[PDB]
Design a protein around this ligand. Structure first.
Ligand code: BCL
Ligand SMILES: CC[C@H]1c2cc3[nH]c4c(c3C)C(=O)[C@H](C(=O)OC)c4c3nc(cc4[nH]c(cc(n2)[C@@H]1C)c(C(C)=O)c4C)[C@@H](C)[C@@H]3CCC(=O)OC/C=C(\C)CCC[C@H](C)CCC[C@H](C)CCCC(C)C
Ligand SMILES: CC[C@H]1c2cc3[nH]c4c(c3C)C(=O)[C@H](C(=O)OC)c4c3nc(cc4[nH]c(cc(n2)[C@@H]1C)c(C(C)=O)c4C)[C@@H](C)[C@@H]3CCC(=O)OC/C=C(\C)CCC[C@H](C)CCC[C@H](C)CCCC(C)C
Ligand SMILES: COC1=C(OC)C(=O)C(C/C=C(\C)CC/C=C(\C)CC/C=C(\C)CC/C=C(\C)CC/C=C(\C)CC/C=C(\C)CC/C=C(\C)CC/C=C(\C)CC/C=C(\C)CCC=C(C)C)=C(C)C1=O
Ligand SMILES: CCCCCC/C=C\CCCCCCCCCC(=O)O[C@H](COC(=O)CCCCCCCCCCCCCCC)COP(=O)(O)OC[C@@H](O)CO
Ligand SMILES: CCCCCC/C=C\CCCCCCCCCC(=O)O[C@H](COC(=O)CCCCCCCCCCCCCCC)COP(=O)(O)OC[C@@H](O)CO
Ligand SMILES: CC(C)=CCC/C(C)=C/C=C/C(C)=C/C=C/C(C)=C/C=C/C=C(C)/C=C/C=C(\C)CC/C=C(\C)CCC=C(C)C
Ligand SMILES: CC(C)=CCC/C(C)=C/C=C/C(C)=C/C=C/C(C)=C/C=C\C=C(C)\C=C\C=C(/C)CC/C=C(\C)CCC=C(C)C
Ligand SMILES: CC(C)=CCC\C(C)=C/C=C\C(C)=C\C=C\C(C)=C\C=C\C=C(C)\C=C\C=C(/C)CC/C=C(\C)CCC=C(C)C
Ligand SMILES: CCCCCCCCCCCCO[C@@H]1O[C@H](CO)[C@@H](O[C@H]2O[C@H](CO)[C@@H](O)[C@H](O)[C@H]2O)[C@H](O)[C@H]1O
Ligand SMILES: CCCCCCCCCCCCO[C@@H]1O[C@H](CO)[C@@H](O[C@H]2O[C@H](CO)[C@@H](O)[C@H](O)[C@H]2O)[C@H](O)[C@H]1O
Ligand SMILES: CCCCCCCCCCCCO[C@@H]1O[C@H](CO)[C@@H](O[C@H]2O[C@H](CO)[C@@H](O)[C@H](O)[C@H]2O)[C@H](O)[C@H]1O
Ligand SMILES: CCCCCCCCCCCCO[C@@H]1O[C@H](CO)[C@@H](O[C@H]2O[C@H](CO)[C@@H](O)[C@H](O)[C@H]2O)[C@H](O)[C@H]1O
Ligand SMILES: CCCCCCCCCCCC[N+](C)(C)[O-]
Ligand SMILES: [Fe+3]
Lengths: 250, 281, 54, 53, 44, 306, 45, 54, 44, 54, 43, 54, 44, 54
């Protein structure tokens, strides 16, 4: 079959390469449309649909059945971002930043944003709570590394904001998710492990200063955290990186 | 254009340089100091590649090649028709890559996320600079770098590899290839596992991370986890690129011979150097 | 022609000025480098050959 | 006078940052060059990998 | 009246006036440079 | 400094997870092994339990016999000398039959027969493992994405060892079982067929391997960057999108003008990874059978100067 | 031309001055490198 | 032909203008480079041969 | 009237009129340049 | 045949128009480049041969 | 009805304008082809 | 035969129309390129030989 | 009185006066250096 | 043989039609290219030889 051509220089290798180009065009189209199941259709800065929707049409809707009687999700579908956003546009023209009209950490805008997730705890495969306090979790213990429980917690202003009283572990993955920190007033807050630095004698939280620890959103049940509460807490702490900047290295 | 959830994230701040001078968006793209720099460098590089194509005499995209200066020029400048255009395009490419990384840093700061993506891109930039800047400077000539052509940089790869016999015998090359292969395998497994959990047999409910852990524990007896797989991917890719840069930085600078002869140190170890039999006896 | 100023009622002056300055500098650098590439208009080479400095 | 010094200080800040990056890059390149000159590369000079000389 | 940018008619007119002055000055400098180069080495 | 979420700071241990039952035969699932702190610094510490079924038994015995055949050939090649075995371990090789035997099974044991025996063992082991990857997903009610992604690598494996040698008419075209010898085979394959750089499907395979490293560095970095919002819980972000998925999408939208979803990124991942071996098998199958000199082919197809 | 000062009512002067300094340094270095590459204007040789 | 103006009720003026500007610049650059690549229309080479500059 | 960009009929008419004036200016300049080139070196 | 207008009741005018324009430009470029690649229809080379611009 | 939300009248008017553009483009292309054919016939 | 219209109650008209258009264009391009590759049907070459152009 | 940056008309005028004084001084220094180099070794 | 219609109560008509069309087109293209690869059935070459075109 070496050198056998149908026309010109077109042999099986040329046929294969052109066939692959056609296949790759089709595959890239499919891949781009599969990724338009969130955030589409596009809209203007006032929320109305945009004139330009791009070159790819929306894919035909698909349906997920949720594992634990949690319902059914259809994507793409109607959007749910109806909570007020405390932002005012800084320009009449499109494509310019929207400035906060208050305290961005409290209003949950910018890097401190959070999404209205379900106000229910995440469940593991057996229908139990996925994230549980370590003392509430049966048989769970610290197996390696420095135990952060009992350590004081220092903010980015180099001041103590509380002390670690518990670890909220993820039961199926067997990993630490949150540190419970008791504040001065005796109440407690949850801080993600990814946002804290456990040291020999302290836990350092670079995102928040000592005065911003009381503003961390609180959870309803002392032994239970929901996806909405998790999202609010994580958004607050991460927005601290930008909106607590004037209170650094003090 | 804006995604349905985009509007609350477009806030001022997070810029390393320029303040609000360039703090805006063009369509979906975020422009900054480094966005403007990236555009200038990329446009100049692409236009100069087109001009190099004009000088070369071909318009076939697969035949266009921008060659570095000859070995006779050393590390000095070369005429634009010979290797000067290559040097300017390399400066433009370096500027574009570094400005892309810094624009990513600005976007990370604005979104309040980690800087893992610019850090991982810096590894690719360092491998590129090893191939065009560090190794040629160590070797003493810009002509040891590769040309900017679709199929002529493959010619450079082949010639550089065969200068030292079969390049398979470079040991850091072996480690980097192992990392690349393991990374492709892990990417396939991770995509497949997430898709199989999210897309079960038709009519069934979504599967949980428990099912993913169960499936690879049933298959291979170990599951690295949802965090572990993404950490593993980052480290596999970065290790592959690191060891590639290492195998090229040692080649032609501390090793000048056939890489197959390097392995004779293990064969010629004193205790089994002279035992008859086998392959080397 | 008497209504071209309305371009400023559609496009923001800030982005337009930034883009125009980028484009102007890029075009000037490109033309200068193209002229430097050509032996017939490389003014440094022309001066070197004219004054026997090379 | 205050305004002149302010403008000069801003321009010098930009120029000094660019210069610091430029001479740091030159310092690294010079380090690589120095390391390459104390290596037996001249005795073991490699052939050109490109069709150009 | 079609305020994509928020400029009024008069603001747009003044901005166009200043932009056009800058454009004409840039073009005049470019014309002088081109005339000098053409006297030095005509490309036609 | 700043915690980059690459190594865990604190390890927590609880009772070992025995896995989901679903429709799995629990009698074929072993017990849980020990817990590895060294592995727990990076991922999960728990080892096991593993599933061992009929296809599992077949695959283990076949692969064990494959390894045993190769190893005993290596030991014979060393003269049964352990020191020589360690000295020349990377230089031993189980080679296919010589080309004068074609595709026949008449080659002697030291001149190709033992390679055929080992290749049969490997064939059975690999196909049994593919069936195992299918059935383990079927037992849990999962989609068969792992099985069809494994089939893409099996395609290149079959082309290298089975399909292309049959189409070329000799077992000598196949890959030897050795460390340095299969590298030598790779180099000689490239040299015999011109330049494998000028194979378009070798180039596509390289593009997709490079893109796998690209994409999975990008994905790992993105998930570690939004792991502070619980972004590593990708299934829950698919079911209930949070700010982690939104921030991850917006970073890439603001960077390169387009983004993915928490689901579709893994479609990108699976396709970018499988296309490596998908294009590689086609590229190898076209070598010698359709194109004998890839550089001349590229010259005739506008890829190299004439 | 007598209204060019309004450029400071559109772009922030503090950032414009820093960017202008970066531009001037980079342009000077580029021109100096181009001259340094030419044999007839290499003052270091 | 009298109703071509309704293109602006379908397509945004900003996107159309930006795309048209990019298209026109790239087309002009391509045509200029194509002419420069042809020796019979490379005006720099034509001038160099006309005035004996080579 | 009714459209995707929220532009009334009169706004679209005004915008098209100014766009067409700009297009005709560009085309006139291009025609003059082409005529000059063709007189200098015809390509037919 | 008189009901072809209903194509606008099925397909999006904006996306159809963008695809139409992109396809038309790419087709025209392909035809022009094919003509340029053929020696007998490369109008620049034809004029060079006709007017002895070699 | 349809899929795009355009009314019957809107679709007819949009088709009218689109076909005017198509006919203008086709007339220009026909003139160009005739000029080229008179210059260099390809048959 | 008089029942083929029911194809439109089985398949999406939009996807069918787009697929048919893409397939027809690719088929036509492939056939035209095949003809150009054959010396006896390349009409540009045939006309060049007929009119003594090359 | 179109402002995006908060400077008043007087502030912009004063700052532009300072900026132009500096620009002319810098250009004069550049002219002197260019004339010195041209005397040393002309490039035309 | 008179109960074959029940195949449509087992298999989805859309998937069956798509698979059948893809297979039929691939088979037809394969056969046509095989015939072109055969010099004794390449109809363009046969006509070229018959009419002394080349
Ligand atoms: C001189 C050397 C040659 C060359 C000749 C070859 C040859 C020959 C081939 C490649 C192929 C590849 N080459 Mg090459 N290659 C060259 C230079 C390069 C360069 C470079 C920068 O120079 C790059 C990056 C590459 C990269 C690559 C990859 C893109 C591709 C391998 C895909 C793969 O992952 O296979 C690895 C995966 C497999 C082999 C499949 C594995 C699946 C099976 C089932 C695994 C079973 C495991 C087994 C049971 C063991 C179990 C053990 C226990 C579990 C522990 N080539 C040159 C010019 N290259 C391959 C290809 O397909 O491209 C056409 C190929 O065949
Ligand atoms: C280090 C691990 C791997 C990695 C990671 C990585 N790459 C990255 C990132 C990361 C984390 C990004 O964030 C960044 C990105 O945004 O990706 C979408 C990127 C990126 N990696 C890219 C490509 C890329 N990565 C590669 C490799 C890798 N990237 C590694 C294997 C390769 C290979 C192996 O060839 C390529 C081609 C881009 C898609 C993107 C960076 C885009 C960029 O730099 O934008 C600005 C610049 C331009 C728009 C182009 C400038 C062009 C020049 C001016 C002229 C041409 C110069 C060039 C050298 C010519 C080449 C000629 C021939 C050799 C072909
Ligand atoms: C998409 C292409 C990429 C890819 C994908 C891929 N590979 C895959 C998969 C996928 C999707 C799987 O699902 C499958 C898998 O299981 O992954 C974990 C697999 C797999 N890919 C593998 C390897 C592999 N993949 C490679 C490459 C790639 N795989 C590509 C880059 C390579 C390379 C580059 O060379 C290798 C080596 C395996 C890890 C696995 C298939 C394993 C298999 O089939 O095993 C069979 C067993 C044998 C032949 C050897 C057994 C040896 C033992 C010594 C047997 C005896 C054991 C003993 C009895 C134990 C006793 C213990 C007691 C005494 C205590
Ligand atoms: C789970 O989460 C995740 C997501 O989703 C929440 C994601 O989406 C992604 C992103 C991944 C994908 C979308 C998959 C596809 C990506 C690839 C296949 C990688 C390869 C990408 C490309 C080849 C695209 C290249 C595009 C580029 C480089 C952008 C082009 C840039 C320009 C043209 C210039 C930009 C600069 C500007 C605009 C400056 C502006 C200045 C002036 C205009 C002046 C990841 C990783 C992820 O993990
Ligand atoms: C497996 C895959 C392997 C290789 C394929 C790699 C190339 C993938 C390219 C994807 C291009 C589709 C992206 C896209 O089409 O994104 C559009 C803009 O993209 C943009 O600016 C940028 C467009 C991308 C430029 C890529 C150039 C190469 C926006 O779309 P929407 O308005 O949201 O609708
Ligand atoms: C300085 C840098 C260069 C200048 C800028 C270039 C920028 C863009 C240009 C991109 C050029 C892409 C060219 C694609 C060609 C497709 C046609 C084709 O499939 O070409 C085939 C071989 O190409 C092939 O392997 C092509 C396959 C290459 C290997 C795979 C690479 C894939 C990369 C993207 C993957 C996603 C052979 O076909 P032919 O009938 O002989 O064609 C003839 C013409 O090439 C002219 O002689
Ligand atoms: C009323 C309402 C509500 C809506 C109305 C919507 C509107 C307006 C629709 C628009 C109407 C229009 C324009 C329709 C146009 C339709 C057209 C051109 C159809 C054309 C069909 C053509 C077909 C099959 C051709 C098939 C051809 C085939 C296999 C060929 C295969 C060839 C092979 C395999 C040979 C290969 C040979 C070699 C390799 C050498
Ligand atoms: C100490 C003790 C006791 C033991 C030590 C054991 C040791 C050292 C083992 C060393 C093992 C090593 C080095 C292995 C290296 C292997 C490598 C690189 C392999 C690379 C590629 C292999 C490939 C493509 C093989 C593909 C084969 C395929 C598709 C199928 C073949 C099927 C055939 C030919 C069946 C033929 C038979 C029948 C039809 C009945
Ligand atoms: C004593 C008195 C009277 C007053 C006191 C003055 C003092 C001390 C301070 C006042 C405040 C200060 C610091 C003001 C400073 C102002 C300055 C530096 C302005 C500088 C402007 C410079 C400009 C536009 C330069 C533009 C240059 C351009 C495009 C060049 C482009 C070149 C190209 C594109 C071709 C390049 C050539 C090739 C590639 C071969
Ligand atoms: C999934 C789909 C499966 C079916 C896929 C079918 C794909 C068919 C694609 C056909 C494309 C043909 O593309 C055309 O092929 C001819 C074959 O000689 C190429 O070859 C042509 O140009 C080259 C370069 O000048 C000449 O050396 C050659 O003699 C000439 O024939 C063309 O450069 C290419 O443009
Ligand atoms: C076979 C390879 C498998 C894939 C890789 C598996 C992981 C391999 C080990 C990676 C290195 C882990 O090594 C381990 O790192 C962690 C975190 O830095 C260290 O942990 C130590 O420092 C951290 C950070 O200051 C403290 O919070 C912790 O309390 C302390 O114990 C361990 O003392 C060290 O033993
Ligand atoms: C130093 C050695 C070589 C390294 C690279 C340096 C090369 C010489 C400097 C080039 C840097 C770019 O030079 C600069 O580019 C940016 C885009 O990046 C643009 O900068 C500016 O132009 C106009 C001028 O008013 C501004 O209004 C606009 O807001 C801004 O973008 C111009 O193009 C140029 O001022
Ligand atoms: C490879 C390495 C590439 C270059 C990396 C940066 C090298 C350091 O570059 C150096 O950074 C420091 C801040 O850390 C800058 O910062 C310093 O100067 C600037 C500008 O006058 C002022 O803010 C201040 O005087 C001081 O902080 C220096 O201007 C720069 O010279
Ligand atoms: C009119 C003279 C202006 C001189 C400008 C000099 C620019 C560079 C200033 C800083 C240089 C020192 N360094 C190393 C930090 O770059
Ligand atoms: Fe993931």
């Amino acid at each position: 079959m070496v050198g056998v051509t149908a026309f010109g220089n077109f042999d099986l290798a040329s046929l294969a390469i052109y066939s692959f180009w056609i296949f790759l065009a089709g595959l890239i189209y499919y891949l781009q449309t599969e990724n338009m199941r969130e955030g589409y259709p596009l809209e203007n800065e006032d929320g109305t649909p945009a004139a330009n929707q791009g070159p790819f049409p929306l894919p035909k809707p698909k349906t997920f059945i949720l594992p634990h009687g949690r319902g059914t999700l259809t994507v793409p579908g109607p959007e749910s971002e109806d909570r007020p956003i405390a932002l005012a546009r800084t320009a009449v023209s499109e494509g310019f930043p929207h400035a906060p009209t208050g305290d961005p950490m409290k209003d949950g805008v910018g890097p401190a944003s959070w999404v209205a997730r379900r106000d229910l705890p995440e469940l593991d495969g057996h229908g139990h709570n996925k994230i549980k306090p370590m003392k509430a979790a049966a048989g769970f213990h610290v197996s390696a590394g420095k135990n952060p429980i009992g350590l004081p917690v220092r903010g980015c202003d180099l001041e103590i904001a509380g002390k670690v009283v518990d670890i909220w572990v993820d039961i199926p993955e067997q990993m630490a998710r949150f540190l419970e920190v008791e504040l001065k007033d005796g109440s407690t807050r949850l801080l993600p492990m990814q946002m804290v630095k456990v040291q020999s004698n302290r836990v350092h939280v670079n995102a928040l200063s000592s005065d911003l620890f009381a503003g961390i959103p609180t959870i309803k049940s002392p032994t239970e955290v929901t996806l909405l509460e998790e999202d609010k807490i994580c958004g607050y702490v991460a927005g601290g990186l930008m909106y607590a900047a004037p209170k650094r290295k003090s | 254009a804006l995604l349905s959830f985009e509007q609350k994230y477009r806030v001022p701040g997070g810029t390393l340089v320029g303040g609000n001078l360039f703090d805006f968006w063009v369509g979906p793209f975020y422009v900054g100091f480094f966005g403007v720099a990236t555009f200038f460098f990329a446009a100049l590089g692409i236009i100069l590649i087109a001009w190099s194509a004009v000088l070369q005499g071909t318009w076939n995209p697969q035949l266009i090649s921008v060659y570095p200066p000859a070995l006779e020029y050393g590390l000095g400048g070369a005429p634009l028709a010979k290797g000067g255009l290559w040097q300017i395009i390399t400066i433009c490419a370096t500027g574009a890559f570094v400005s892309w990384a810094l624009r990513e840093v600005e976007i990370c700061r604005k979104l309040g996320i980690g800087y893992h993506i610019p850090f991982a891109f810096a590894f690719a930039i360092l491998a590129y600079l090893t191939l065009v800047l560090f190794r040629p400077v160590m070797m003493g000539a810009w002509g040891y770098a590769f040309p900017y052509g679709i199929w002529t940089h493959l010619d450079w790869v082949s010639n550089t590899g065969y200068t030292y016999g079969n390049f398979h015998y470079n040991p850091a090359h072996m480690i980097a290839i192992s990392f690349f292969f393991t990374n492709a395998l892990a990417l396939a497994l991770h995509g497949a596992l997430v898709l199989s959990a999210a897309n079960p047999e038709k009519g069934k409910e979504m599967r949980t991370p428990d099912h993913e852990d169960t499936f690879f524990r049933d298959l291979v007896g170990y599951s690295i986890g949802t965090l572990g797989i993404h950490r593993l991917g980052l480290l596999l890719s970065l290790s592959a690129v690191f060891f590639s840069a290492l195998c090229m930085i040692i080649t032609g600078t501390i090793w000048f011979d056939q890489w197959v002869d390097w392995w004779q140190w293990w064969v010629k170890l004193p205790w089994w150097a002279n035992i008859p039999g086998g392959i080397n006896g | 022609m008497s209504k071209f100023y309305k371009i400023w009622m559609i496009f923001d002056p800030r982005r337009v000025f930034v883009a125009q300055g980028v484009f102007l500098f890029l075009l000037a650098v490109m033309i200068h480098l193209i002229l430097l590439s050509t032996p017939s208009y490389n003014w440094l080479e022309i001066s070197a050959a004219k004054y026997n400095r090379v | 006078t205050n305004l002149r010094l302010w403008v000069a200080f801003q321009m010098m800040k930009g120029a000094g940052w660019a210069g610091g990056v430029f001479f740091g890059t030159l310092l690294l390149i010079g380090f690589f060059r120095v390391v390459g000159r104390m290596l037996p590369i001249q005795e073991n000079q490699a052939p050109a990998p490109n069709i150009t000389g | 009246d079609l305020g994509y940018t928020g400029l009024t008619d008069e603001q747009a007119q003044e901005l166009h006036s200043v932009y056009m002055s800058g454009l004409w000055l840039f073009s005049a400098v470019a014309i002088v440079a081109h005339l000098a180069v053409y006297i030095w080495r005509p490309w036609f | 400094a700043e915690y980059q979420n690459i190594f865990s700071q604190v390890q927590v241990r609880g009772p070992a997870d025995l896995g989901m039952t679903e429709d799995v035969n629990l009698a074929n699932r072993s017990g849980v092994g020990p817990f590895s702190t060294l592995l727990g610094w990076f991922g999960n510490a728990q080892l096991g339990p593993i599933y061992l079924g009929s296809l599992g038994v077949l695959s283990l015995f076949s692969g064990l016999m494959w390894f045993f055949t190769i190893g005993i050939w290596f030991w014979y090649q060393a003269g049964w000398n352990p020191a020589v075995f360690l000295r020349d371990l990377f230089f031993f090789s189980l080679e296919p039959p010589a080309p004068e035997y074609g595709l026949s099974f008449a080659a002697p044991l030291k001149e190709g027969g033992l390679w055929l025996i080992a290749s049969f063992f490997m064939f059975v082991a690999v196909w049994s493992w593919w069936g195992r990857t299918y059935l383990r997903a079927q037992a849990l009610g999962m989609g068969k994405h792992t099985a069809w992604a494994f089939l893409s690598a099996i395609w290149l494996w079959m082309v290298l060892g089975f399909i292309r040698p049959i189409l070329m008419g000799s077992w000598s075209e196949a890959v030897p079982y050795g460390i340095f010898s299969h590298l030598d085979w790779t180099n000689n394959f490239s040299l015999v067929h011109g330049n494998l750089f000028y194979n378009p499907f070798h180039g596509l395979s390289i593009a997709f391997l490079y893109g796998s490293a690209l994409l999975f560095a990008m994905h790992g970095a993105t998930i570690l960057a939004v792991s502070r919002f619980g972004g590593e819980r990708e299934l829950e972000q698919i079911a209930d999108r949070g700010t982690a998925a939104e921030r991850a999408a917006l970073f890439w939208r603001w960077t390169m003008g387009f983004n993915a979803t928490m689901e579709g990124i893994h479609r990108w991942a699976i396709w970018m990874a499988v296309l490596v071996t998908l294009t590689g098998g086609i590229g190898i199958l076209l070598s010698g059978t359709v194109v004998d000199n890839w550089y001349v082919w590229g010259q005739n197809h506008g890829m190299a100067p004439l």
